[PDB]
Design an enzyme around this catalytic site. Structure first.
Site, short mmCIF file in Angstrom:
data_model
loop_
_atom_site.label_atom_id
_atom_site.label_comp_id
_atom_site.label_asym_id
_atom_site.label_seq_id
_atom_site.Cartn_x
_atom_site.Cartn_y
_atom_site.Cartn_z
N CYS C 152 0.95 -1.18 0.14
CA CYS C 152 -0.13 0.01 -0.21
C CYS C 152 0.72 1.16 0.02
O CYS C 152 0.60 2.19 -0.56
CB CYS C 152 -1.02 -0.07 1.12
SG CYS C 152 -0.29 -0.34 2.72
N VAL C 156 0.24 4.39 -2.34
CA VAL C 156 -0.39 5.78 -2.05
C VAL C 156 0.84 6.83 -2.78
O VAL C 156 0.27 7.99 -2.99
CB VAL C 156 -0.10 5.92 -0.47
CG1 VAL C 156 -0.14 7.33 0.01
CG2 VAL C 156 -1.24 5.09 0.34
#
Ligand code: ICS
Ligand code: ICS
Ligand SMILES: [Fe+3]
Ligand SMILES: [Fe+3]
Lengths: 522, 477, 522, 477
Positions: C152, C156
């Site tokens: 992740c 991001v």
């Protein structure tokens, strides 16, 4: 009472207060029961070494045997042949039991007939029963073969199977060509496995003894396989599978796997699959004959060597790692086929499981029982897993067998606290699990009552049962599994380690008391 | 089906038999006719089985050890002979009991003399006497021993009566010899009779002088209920809410002391007529105790029975009888309301032992079902008399039915449910016909009494309406 | 203290009196613990309907989820390809976790690398990580392919996977023709199964998107099979078996059964078997593509229909009797092969087992959870058994799926008391098995903690766990099982009926109290 | 093996790497030399991992949540981010506790904010504050909350410090924000440090406003024992038999109150230097509490440690120390006499985290075993200083070893036993090499203290001498 939305069967219905009060009234009123303190006191005594010593002095009394009687074995052997009706000469009560016994284990139909000898036959013998019996059986159930065994009534009055069947042919009750192999199967001799050996040598004799002239050993390039008394479908199938993978021509002699597992598709099939007569007639032409369970195929072996001239290899039951290796190597030697990559990989997968599971299995103590070949193969595999087979019971075992198992124990440090018992029964075994408590039992459904008994002494004394053997009546479909070869070794390993982890989970399930060790990961 | 259709079904099926077997079986197959009420004009029974035809019958040993003596919970029963009989019948029959097994109760244990060929040769009488001392050492709280003879015993000249009398005297112990060898008779039935004579001769008369038991006007015994899945307890509870005192149960959950107190009762209540009418007749002639048949299968028969039994006593029992019937009224009504729609109009074929093939008919009818065929393994003509009264017009009746026959009958009649034994069960499942075990209750039950009717109904429904039966045909053929 | 000949591990060591005393003193002295009555009061409260209503009002808090994050599924998918190294672009902490998560379920090595992105990457992106990572990976572990997903952090930050990989090839870190398929697999979207779907589409796109011109549908006479997220070796193996028995040409796309089951024979094999690059390049030439778990293969489905032009059949997961029938019939349709005697017989053997066991299964109430296709097949099979699937929980389920399962429930009388939950977790389920107690749970190892909680309220409230799903960490070798096809239906049925009978034996084991119903035969 | 054999093994292995990776990895691999005792002259440590090389390392979240905060039993720890981290680390570490889970203790539960893409887009602080309220409603007996940040939290600019101040003040509750995002640092190690400072700043300062505790001269704290398999319990029992009072355990079976009491103690006992030397230094600075390193692995080290600790106090403690040592002497001597013959001469290779790769050497030596290779995932050079002193001459040392290196080293050195982690275990089993997990203790233990040594020995024996190892070779090849 019942509430219609939640109907109670005997359990827990009889726990309702009104049933409970009724039961206490019955007891107190009319049963003249020994007082509970006296019951508790005698129970406690039956768990002691003192009691055990009395138990082991029994000479005449047997309690809770772990064996059955010969004709049971003859029926199972008979069922392995194509369109073959097993036929027990003697009294019908026995055949009701044989059928129901197997019905309950396999959850399949089990076809068998009796010729219903009665009291009258004590004067005149069972010749007329045999004549009408075979004629009736052939006309009604249309077998291609009838395989004849005996009940003890027939054996005690001394009916001559050979003469009776010959007379039935002579007086035209059944065609002279119609195959009627037979074996005497007295139930006061040996046990159910002996019945299997007797039946099989009976059938082998019938198709080969008079035709040996033109036979040539190895001329058909196959290996005969004789399975013995075998109540796991997986075991027939793993043998066939391994040999097919090897490209090894084979003949499995007595093969009940189809007739013990017919589909529910809207019709009842009395017969299915099985060894053909042609396969039995041809079997002396095989390279050799391999006995999967040698410690109850001794008569068969004498015939196979004495008449077919095959040199039966000295092989243990192919159970666990070493003995499966040895089986495959000997088959390779006989057949000339190399052990294939698929079997070598399967082996390495079993060995991986052993390294995966060894820390939970190590040093675990077992009490176990069963027939001799099964028991020694279980013993051997336990030792390979680093387990301790403390109480080894084989009710129908013999001296020579016990010496070989004792030899197997001696060669392993994991055998040091092991004892082999022969001629001893589950009431003897019950004493042993009390006085020299193991971690688990491995055995058939009768062992559930020993577990009940241990639990009654206390939760810390409870010895849980792990069901492997025959009969298994109180779980469903275990008869489909496998105990032979790498496959059965894998199944057994998995069952053992997970019984251990189930039991640990139970002992650590107590919140704040013991669940500090209730690990997610094991 | 019509009468004529059933009759040609019979002839068709019998065409496969050799001539001798055909002529015999023909006498054991019949179509029920309301104008005929004498079974002896209609069907033959209690004859030997024809050889090789796969009868469903057991033997006298099963009738004696397995059925009558085995359940007696505080005696030890010895299976005297080779290892099989005692092992095949170990815990096969669900005769339920309360007890501490191996200590004061012994029902699910298998005690055996495990005959070897040496015992065939020298006889087994010394081994048996040694066996009894060993039993006494290891199981001190046993209150009696029975010796259940297997096939070899009579055949070799053994004298168990002598051992039983000697050891009995020596140990001050009730030791009962039973000559139930499997070659005796033609079926389980003769085993019942032999078993009854044994209770009479060796047990029942022990307290004939004794008078320390306190009797009441309402003393009864339950005769021939073997407490299959608790059947006798769910019967007993009803008789005592009616204000009666149940002194004994023969023999499910039964103790030897109950059995010895039975000649003290006011009335014997016989469920299983076939297995114990013998001792009931004895108790009538010797102690003056009357006996009556009853039926606790389904609410209809249970209410009839309760009333008939209550009429044997005073108004206080008749009043409590009405109280019991009013108490359970909404419970069995709830059962009928739920399950009768799910079962009505379904057709059942039965094949069982010597009682239930007629006795459960009322329970099926209480759920709107129809019994279109029924039969027994070992019933006598007095059973068939009673059967023709319970069964419908033109229904099929079969005595000592063969496997082939039962199979062919089913294929033609195509019932929605079959109720029979463990040797039959897996056959008809394969055919895709719902099957319920009507001996073992398929490990369910009780089926007796009101509480039992709720379970009986639940059980016929779960099996008749199961989704598995739709599945037997693969979509592709 | 220890006795050298009987060493105690944590359990039961800490039950010794001196440890017990020590723990009591620690508690009483320094832990400032709530009094035991207060703890008992609050526990009682957590079992109540009142607590359940509060629990189900949660919006922000999640407790004991029944799902994992995307790249876990991408990793598993990538492992199914020949000599392929799963490579997760982003931070290395994730990769340690994915590996140990699968290590513990399969008890096998699990190969996967990170390119070890740190805080510094927030300035400059992960491009240098990708260049050095691919070069290092290829040289050191010699894959034939590297299949890239993301953590992740990377998502991001906004790393462009496609550009970074193109630049790695351009600047010479890896050969241009060396296969590096990729997928963005953001853990804050969907779940582990979405990551599987994303990774597979990524690999399918890599080998076919630019090559479609010479493709012809049907031209290779094969059927493509996409298994999705699958953690039972038996499931890959049963599908290949059935198709082989049918004589059906097939390509199993993502096939990790070899690399998740290498032999222990003295050497460690980083790679084994798997789907070849040639199979993926040639897949558009199949007759059609069948998706074993359609409810998490939606992205793949769109690519396969939109690009390969295959007409993906509408099939449920092949679980249970009906849906296995349907699978075999659609495959027969597409391929032109008939369904063989072997599979017909196997089907009838399953149906036979259903008739054998229906009386114990009937009406039995279950709580269950898992992934959407697994759970709906289990629901489906349970209904065919006459069982009642009361609490159906699928944490990563969705509205459309829930409707389909609700439809399946309404079509059967056994669906009447059943409720399907989506977005709910195992803390919601715990409340449900308290307030609306079922007979058993079917689920993964996290369920053992619910069983513990229920037992704490009382033995009559305990809900025993039956372990079927992922992950199973606290039993050994269940990952070798099967749940698909008739074989899996057989296995599941057996596990279910025997868990019921084990539990009945426990409740009737009490001598003289409940063992009137401790039957030898069931 | 000789130094030059080992040195050439290292070069050989590094031949496969691209130049940049070879030059870096060469710095992290070394052969111990007794003449050099400054690690900074022979090995580099605590640097980033080279990409794509399959490091065994975890992240800062694992170091904060998994290791330091997660074991605190009466607090609730929120894994704040997407579902992964929280799930893969749910109950994977055996940090044992006593408590009622779900009610007053929460260690093996997984509490998470389960980020969706909306939480990335709009931020997670509102969800965090809502989640805290729900936690308070459903778990009222929790004594405090911590918020363990996963990767996205800092990257999207959330402010968990603010949510913690506000909700804390609102609810009169300890709410601890921990910025342990896995992109931070290069390994678990920075997660330790972050987690230690979180304790200093949000927990530890709280009973500076409280003196109602009763102190004694013998109050200590066990610092950095996470009670794996009970390890801390089997350490604590010894310390207390020695006469000491263990006020706190950090943080295995740790409560928040005992953590808050720790600044009241007289001596801080540090087992895991790597993970908690930071807070130990702070307590020394702020409260004047001295701290000392100890080792409870094996009798030799445990005995040395008890004496070293007892020497910090008076003669009574020193006297009870010798009573403890006298008490356990026969027990650990029995263990040695049984297992040392079965294990002596065997060569072990170790690879673990931050402490055990050096701390367990003495116990292997107490069984006659030789550690020929050892290394750490995330140690600093002060760890390697202490290591060079415990390891033999010419032993192989490896920092942040690659999967490739570890495998190649083992193939050449061929140790009798490997001690490492779950990601390694099944690799080396396939090679026919006995493996013991030296994080999870392979679901066994405790290994600390005298009682732990017995289990330790048992475990090394059962695996090293197991029959399975002889079977990997098919007899036919
Ligand atoms: S005794 Fe008889 S065969 Fe009356 S031998 Fe048999 S437990 Fe049957 S129809 Mo098994 S005359 Fe009882 C019987 Fe009926 S064993 Fe049970 S079910 S009511
Ligand atoms: S805290 Fe550290 S990696 Fe010191 S992060 Fe790690 S429970 Fe290891 S070598 Mo797992 S510095 Fe503890 C450790 Fe050692 S999790 Fe355990 S075994 S003694
Ligand atoms: Fe069946
Ligand atoms: Fe493995």
């Amino acid at each position: 009472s019942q509430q219609v939305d939640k109907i109670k069967a005997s359990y827990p219905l009889f726990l309702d207060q009104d049933y409970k009060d009724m039961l206490a009234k019955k007891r107190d009123g009319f049963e003249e029961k020994y007082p509970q303190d006296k019951i508790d006191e005698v129970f406690q005594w039956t768990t002691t070494k003192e009691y055990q010593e009395l138990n082991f002095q029994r000479e005449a009394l047997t309690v809770n045997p772990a064996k059955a009687c010969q004709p049971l074995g003859a029926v199972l052997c008979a069922l392995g042949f194509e369109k073959t009706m097993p036929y027990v000469h003697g009294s019908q009560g026995c055949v009701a039991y044989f059928r129901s016994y197997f019905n309950r284990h396999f959850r399949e139909p089990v076809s068998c007939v009796s010729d219903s000898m009665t009291e009258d036959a004590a004067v005149f013998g069972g010749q007329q029963n045999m004549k009408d019996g075979l004629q009736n059986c052939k006309a009604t159930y249309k077998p291609d073969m009838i395989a004849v065994s005996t009940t003890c009534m027939a054996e005690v009055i001394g009916d001559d199977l050979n003469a009776f069947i010959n007379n039935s042919k002579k007086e035209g009750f059944i065609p002279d060509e119609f195959p009627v192999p037979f074996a005497h199967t007295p139930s006061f001799v040996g046990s159910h496995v002996t019945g299997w050996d007797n039946m099989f040598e009976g059938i082998a004799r019938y198709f080969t003894l008079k035709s040996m002239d033109d036979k040539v050993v190895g001329s058909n390039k196959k290996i005969n396989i004789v399975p013995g008394f075998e109540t796991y479908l997986g075991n027939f199938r793993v043998i066939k599978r391994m040999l097919s993978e090897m490209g090894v021509g084979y003949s499995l002699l007595s093969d009940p796997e189809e007739v013990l597992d017919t589909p529910a598709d809207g019709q009842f099939r009395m017969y299915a699959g099985g060894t053909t007569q042609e396969e039995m007639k041809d079997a002396p032409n095989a390279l050799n004959t391999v006995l999967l369970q040698p410690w109850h195929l001794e008569k068969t072996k004498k015939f196979v060597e004495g008449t077919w001239k095959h040199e039966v290899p000295k092989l243990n039951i192919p159970m666990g790692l070493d003995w499966t290796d040895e089986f495959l190597m000997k088959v390779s030697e006989i057949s000339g086929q190399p052990i294939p990559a698929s079997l070598t990989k399967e082996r390495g997968r079993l060995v991986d499981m052993m390294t995966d599971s060894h820390t939970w299995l190590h040093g675990k103590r077992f009490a176990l029982w069963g027939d001799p070949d099964f028991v020694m193969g279980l013993v051997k595999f336990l030792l390979e897993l680093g387990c301790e087979p403390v109480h080894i019971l084989c009710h129908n075992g013999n001296k020579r067998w016990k010496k070989a198992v004792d030899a197997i124990l001696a060669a392993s440090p994991y055998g040091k606290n092991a004892t082999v018992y022969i001629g001893k029964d589950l009431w003897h075994l019950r004493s042993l699990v009390f006085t020299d408590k193991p971690d688990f039992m491995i055995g058939n459904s009768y062992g559930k009552f020993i577990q009940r008994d241990t639990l009654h002494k206390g939760k810390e004394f409870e010895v849980p049962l792990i069901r492997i053997g025959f009969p298994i009546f109180d779980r469903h479909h275990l008869h489909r599994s496998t105990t032979l070869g790498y496959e059965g070794a894998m199944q057994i390993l998995t069952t053992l380690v997970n019984s251990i982890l189930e039991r640990l989970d139970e002992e650590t399930r107590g919140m704040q008391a013991t669940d500090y060790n209730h690990d997610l990961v094991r | 089906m019509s009468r004529e259709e059933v009759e040609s079904l019979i002839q068709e099926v019998l065409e496969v038999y050799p001539e001798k077997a055909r002529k015999d079986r023909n006498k054991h197959l019949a179509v029920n006719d309301p104008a005929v009420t004498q079974s002896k004009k209609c069907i033959i029974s209690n004859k030997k089985s024809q050889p090789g035809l796969m009868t469903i019958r057991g033997c006298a040993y099963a009738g004696s050890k397995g059925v009558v003596w085995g359940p007696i919970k505080d005696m030890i029963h010895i299976s005297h002979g080779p290892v099989g009989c005692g092992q095949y019948s170990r815990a096969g029959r669900r005769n339920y009991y309360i007890g501490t097994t191996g200590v004061n109760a012994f029902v699910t244990m298998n005690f055996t003399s495990d005959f070897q060929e040496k015992d065939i040769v020298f006889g087994g009488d010394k081994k048996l006497a040694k066996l009894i001392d060993e039993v006494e050492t290891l199981f001190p709280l046993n209150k009696g021993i029975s010796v259940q003879s297997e096939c070899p015993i009579g055949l070799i000249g053994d004298d168990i009566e002598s051992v039983s009398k000697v050891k009995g005297a020596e140990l001050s112990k009730t030791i009962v010899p039973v000559r139930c060898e499997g070659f005796r008779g033609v079926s389980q039935s003769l085993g019942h009779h032999i078993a009854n004579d044994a209770v009479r001769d060796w047990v029942l008369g022990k307290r004939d002088e004794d008078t320390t038991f306190a009797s009441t006007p309402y003393d009864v015994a339950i005769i021939g209920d073997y407490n299959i899945g608790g059947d006798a307890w769910s019967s007993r509870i009803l008789l005592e809410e009616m204000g009666l005192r149940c002194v004994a149960q023969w023999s499910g959950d039964g103790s030897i002391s109950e059995i010895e107190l039975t000649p003290k009762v006011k009335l014997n209540l016989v469920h299983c007529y076939r297995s114990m009418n013998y001792i009931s007749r004895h108790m009538e002639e010797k102690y003056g105790i009357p006996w009556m048949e009853y039926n606790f299968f389904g609410p209809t028969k249970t209410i009839e029975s309760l009333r008939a039994i209550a009429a044997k006593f005073d108004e206080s029992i008749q009043k409590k009888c009405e109280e019991v019937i009013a108490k359970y009224k909404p419970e069995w009504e709830a059962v009928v309301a739920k399950y009768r729609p799910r079962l009505e109009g379904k057709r059942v074929m039965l094949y069982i032992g010597g009682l239930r093939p007629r006795h459960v008919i009322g329970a099926y009818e209480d759920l709107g079902m129809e019994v279109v065929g029924t039969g027994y393994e070992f019933a006598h003509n007095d059973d068939y008399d009673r059967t023709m009264k319970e069964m419908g017009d033109s229904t099929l009746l079969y005595d000592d039915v063969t496997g082939y026959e039962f199979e062919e009958f089913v294929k033609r009649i195509k019932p929605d449910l079959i109720g029979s034994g463990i040797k039959e069960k897996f056959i008809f499942q394969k055919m895709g016909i719902p099957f319920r075990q009507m001996h073992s209750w398929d490990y369910s039950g009780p089926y007796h009494g009101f509480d039992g009717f709720a379970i009986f109904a639940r059980d016929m429904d779960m099996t008749l309406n199961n989704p598995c039966w739709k599945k037997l045909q693969a979509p592709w053929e």
